[PDB]
Design an enzyme around this catalytic site. Structure first.
Site, short mmCIF file in Angstrom:
data_model
loop_
_atom_site.label_atom_id
_atom_site.label_comp_id
_atom_site.label_asym_id
_atom_site.label_seq_id
_atom_site.Cartn_x
_atom_site.Cartn_y
_atom_site.Cartn_z
N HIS A 120 0.68 -1.08 -0.32
CA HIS A 120 -0.09 -0.02 -0.34
C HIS A 120 1.11 1.43 0.35
CE1 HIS A 120 -4.05 2.37 1.66
NE2 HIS A 120 -4.27 1.29 0.64
N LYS A 126 2.84 4.08 -0.98
CA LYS A 126 3.36 5.30 -1.88
C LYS A 126 4.95 5.85 -1.66
CE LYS A 126 -1.69 4.64 -2.52
NZ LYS A 126 -1.78 3.32 -1.74
N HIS A 173 -8.33 11.08 0.39
CA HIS A 173 -7.89 10.10 -0.20
C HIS A 173 -6.80 10.27 0.78
CE1 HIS A 173 -4.88 6.89 -2.61
NE2 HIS A 173 -6.29 6.31 -2.42
N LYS A 228 -3.98 10.63 4.34
CA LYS A 228 -4.54 9.52 5.41
C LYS A 228 -3.78 11.17 6.67
CE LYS A 228 -4.48 6.29 2.88
NZ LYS A 228 -6.19 6.61 1.56
#
Ligand SMILES: O=C(O)c1ncc(O)nc1C(=O)O
Length: 437
Positions: free
Chosen positions: A102, A104, A327, A329
């Protein structure tokens, strides 16, 4: 500003709300460096789109895509990249079920040095179009002269911590990047790395990852203050995992306890969770399709209705982004009047045990399913006791740019959390449509 914290550009807001935002084309521009090679760590990829975001003169430079896809998904990704001879792939190992890659992150090797980009967007058009996304941009790291022996380490230990995160992949293509990082001077880095990697960690290694990593950093590098019990915790995310039958199982036991940590000594602390309501999504720039990237399922939610009384609406007047669905967090520790914060985290990690870790084996082992990555801003790392909150995100440079409004606003009685796999046909969205899965 010392923080180098950015939002992505949003199509449709006035120019003043994109002044100082960054599109992916800006990040990859020759103005940021003369690209030699790059690594794209991510979850979802549109390879055709991705190559077009590089400047034309850089589009044949080598690219490494780091992903977690298997079986047909993996074959689909390989098919995407096959027309570009310069693209290699690294399949991150996911040996625990339900985990994902996950993280990025971009590693950008230039002629002039090295840059690290840790962010929250998938590499697809819609994630950089009308969503609220976060970026941390490292300094341009210079190369260490050959024959010179220095650490290149920062006071936050970022260089070693990034190498340690990459070594967890056990991957030959990433050993190449580890050697690149070894050759650069990262000492100017003022943020702490917080990663998750899949595994079961005990003993010393327990503090390396997930929410225990956060706890250790807060224990070691933040200080407690009088009336700390009154400083809330804020978590802000775009997906929610199964957290258990009640708040004692994980959310308010181990997760909140890590997030409450300040200083070295040994709870009515308010917990605000920010997650878009159905109305937030319906009235958004994207309309109901924004909910495609807010994958809270009805099967999860119906088993934890206790959670939704923690939920607060998405609101971002401060950055002109109330209608740009989150989007990004983020997690943070504001003062009781929300005028200061004790720390701020931007990360890929949603509110799930898979991302943050869950204790196993009578509290002696931290089990993590997924790869995740974020950067922690601590006042001590900037010579401060606390950050003041910047009043307008884009308007004394040592105030931290929080991208959404404070205090968060509780859901109203008729509000519901966005749940992506049930229909919404009572009222149409900004494009004239209903939502029918
Ligand atoms: O963006 C998405 O569609 C998405 N889907 C599933 C998941 O676990 N995470 C994400 C994310 O990138 O936040």
């Amino acid at each position: 500003n010392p923080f180098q914290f950015y939002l992505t550009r949003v199509s449709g807001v006035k120019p003043k709300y994109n002044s100082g935002a960054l599109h992916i084309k800006d990040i990859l521009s020759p103005l940021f460096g003369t690209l030699v090679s790059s690594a794209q760590f991510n979850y979802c990829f549109d390879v055709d789109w991705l190559v077009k975001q590089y400047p034309p003169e850089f589009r044949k430079k080598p690219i490494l895509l780091v992903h977690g896809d298997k079986r047909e998904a993996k074959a689909h990704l390989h098919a995407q990249a096959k027309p570009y001879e310069n693209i290699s792939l690294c399949q991150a190992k996911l040996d625990i079920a339900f985990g994902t890659h996950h993280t990025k992150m971009m590693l950008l090797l230039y002629e002039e040095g090295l840059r690290v980009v840790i962010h929250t967007s998938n590499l697809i058009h819609a994630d950089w179009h009308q969503k609220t996304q976060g970026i941390w941009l490292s300094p341009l790291y210079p190369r260490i002269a050959d024959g010179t022996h220095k650490s290149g380490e920062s006071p936050t230990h970022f260089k070693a911590d990034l190498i340690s995160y990459l070594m967890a992949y056990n991957a030959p293509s990433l050993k190449e990047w580890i050697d690149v990082i070894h050759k650069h001077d990262l000492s100017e880095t003022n943020v702490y790395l917080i990663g998750s990697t899949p595994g079961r960690f005990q003993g010393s290694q327990k503090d390396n990852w997930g929410h225990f990593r956060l706890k250790k950093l807060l224990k070691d590098h933040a200080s407690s203050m009088p009336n700390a019990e009154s400083w809330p915790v804020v978590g802000q995310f775009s997906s929610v995992g199964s957290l258990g039958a009640d708040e004692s199982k994980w959310l308010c036991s181990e997760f909140k306890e890590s997030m409450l940590t300040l200083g070295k000594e040994s709870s009515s602390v308010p917990l605000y969770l920010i997650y878009p309501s159905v109305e937030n999504v319906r009235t958004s720039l994207e309309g109901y399709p924004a909910g495609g990237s807010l994958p809270y399922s009805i099967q999860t939610a119906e088993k934890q209705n206790w959670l939704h009384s923690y939920f607060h609406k998405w609101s971002a007047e401060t950055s002109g982004r109330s209608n740009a669905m989150p989007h990004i967090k983020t997690y943070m520790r504001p003062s009781p009047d929300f005028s200061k914060i004790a720390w701020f985290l931007v990360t890929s990690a949603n509110l799930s045990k898979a991302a943050w870790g869950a204790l196993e084996k009578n509290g002696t082992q931290l089990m993590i399913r997924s790869y995740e990555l974020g950067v922690l801003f601590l006042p001590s790392a900037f010579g401060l006791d606390s950050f003041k909150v910047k009043q307008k995100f884009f308007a004394p440079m040592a105030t931290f740019p929080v991208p959404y409004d404070l205090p968060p606003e509780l859901y109203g009685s008729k509000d519901r959390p966005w749940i992506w796999n049930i229909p919404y046909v009572k009222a149409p969205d900004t494009h004239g449509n209903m939502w029918v899965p």
